[PDB]
């Protein structure tokens, strides 16, 4: 029962900070992975961080722009998204795994929209 | 007694790290497989 | 294309198999650590 | 989501049981499944595990040769067949989509296994 | 531009060490793997090794074969132990998503008595 | 029951291959691992390999060291590449959960 938050609308080239949290459930001991799913497409991996934070992984399409990090004290994993592009529009998801096939529950996700509408 | 403890912790943490790394490799390969399937 | 496809599938299955094997390894090592701590 | 354990109960030393792990309407075909047990006042132990493809089975050293794990995707169930029980096998047994307890985020009620005369 | 060597004729229970000379373009920083083509069958994946030496193997060879790489030499190795007649095939090396375009000649491996 | 060899003096960036010859009771079917004891410090775990050749490594050495085993010779090997001064220690091999009192003389490795 992880809940994603952050995200909304941003101009192309702008930035957002997604956060992953689970009130009352200590994440210190969990791999945390970020996935995203764009319109009509299949869900794909974005980044994830090992329990100890000694290791971070990033999808190639996103290397150099995104940064994943966590704080045990705040019990949150964060994903900093810089230089956002239209192609990054998607629902972003949080899970205790880097491998989508390991995930048993998907959140509501949080919507990220990159556009020059507003 | 003290030594064996850190060795276990240290090695268990190393296993968890490889699990995460292999998890990430699996996702990458699963995705590559989907793209091939769509190319058919 | 078909040949490349069976190779991706067969390898992904091998990765999922090693994940299971490594998970069990961590569990075993985790238990061995618990017993050592209580042997104190 | 919500795996349910069944098959537990009482047996005399040397008896047998088939524990079941099921999750109505939720296909396990693609999941590792692991059996754990927890005895009174002791810490939760791994018992057995089976991979998604069923190509691989693992067993706690203590239970080797007595228990067998298997899965039937058609019945959407993983079984743990337990033979030759001994009084140290008394514990609440638990099901999960992982072999590694630390990966497990929700534990069932379990099913109680008590073995004694 | 892959060139494998080291195969040959061996008895059941024997050993072999295959070698693969890689281009450095194909090799450097990429996962490398061994494949094989048994008689009358299709070319199958056998083992994979990452740049940092994480390995995995097909079901039929796990526990008997061991893959390794020399990052200074752009070379990949397959140590084959406890060989069985089923292991008779032509062996090829490549990057793990194999390059449809470039397959070296392979190295013939025969097991029988 | 354990026999380590292959250490010595090496330049930064160099290579070494350690060997550990074990008796069949220690080795056959058991995970084997290499440990190292840096000067004035406590003995630390470094890498592990299972009977079926699954490996994992400590962070400080992952990607530079490669552990392997020869099941027919009951021998464990550690290929050390891109060596750094930090790697200087006495290296020891053992069955994977290393048990106190069951250690060998080790092999000293010095880098500079």
Residue numbers in the entry:
A (entry chain A): 3 to 120
B (entry chain E), C (entry chain F): 1 to 40
D (entry chain B): 2 to 118
E (entry chain C): 3 to 115
F (entry chain D): 3 to 114
List passages from the publication reporting this PDB structure.
Here, we present and characterize a panel of nanobodies that can be used to functionalize designed proteins built using CC dimers such as protein origami. The nanobodies were selected to bind to different CC modules representing the edges of the designed tetrahedral protein. The crystal structures of five complexes consisting of CC dimers and nanobodies show that the nanobodies bind primarily to the noninteracting sites of the CC dimers and, in addition to complementarity determining region 3 (CDR) loops, strongly rely on the nanobody framework residues for binding. The most extensively characterized protein origami cage, tetrahedron TET12SN, self-assembles from a single 461 amino acid residue polypeptide chain consisting of 12 CC dimer-forming modules adopting antiparallel or parallel orientations (APH2, BCR2, GCN2, P3-P4, P5-P6, and P7-P8).
In contrast to other binders of APH2, the combination Nb28 and Nb30 is able to bind APH2 concomitantly, indicating that their binding epitopes do not overlap. The crystal structure shows that Nb28 and Nb30 bind to the opposite sides of APH2 and form a ternary Nb282-Nb302-APH2 complex. Interestingly, in this complex, there are no direct interactions between Nb28 and Nb30 molecules. The orientation of Nb28 is parallel to the APH2 axis, similar to that observed for the complex with Nb49. Long CDR3 forms favorable interactions with residues at positions e and f, while it also extends over the second APH chain to shield the hydrophobic core of CC (residues at position a). In addition to the Nb282-APH2 interface, the complex is stabilized by an additional interface between two Nb28 molecules, which buries about 650 Å2 of solvent-accessible surface and is stabilized by interactions between CDR1 from the first and CDR3 from the second Nb28 molecule. Nb30 recognizes a unique APH2 epitope which does not involve the W24f side chain. Two Nb30 molecules bind antiparallel to each other and perpendicular to the axis of APH2. The main feature of the Nb30-APH2 interface is an extensive use of non-CDR residues (e.g., W47 on strand C’ and W58 on strand C”) that shield the hydrophobic residues at positions d (e.g., I15d) in the APH2 core. Given that APH2 alone is sufficient to observe the cooperative effect and since no direct interactions between Nb28 and Nb30 are observed in the structure of the ternary complex, the positive cooperativity appears to be mediated allosterically through the conformation or dynamics of the APH2 dimer.
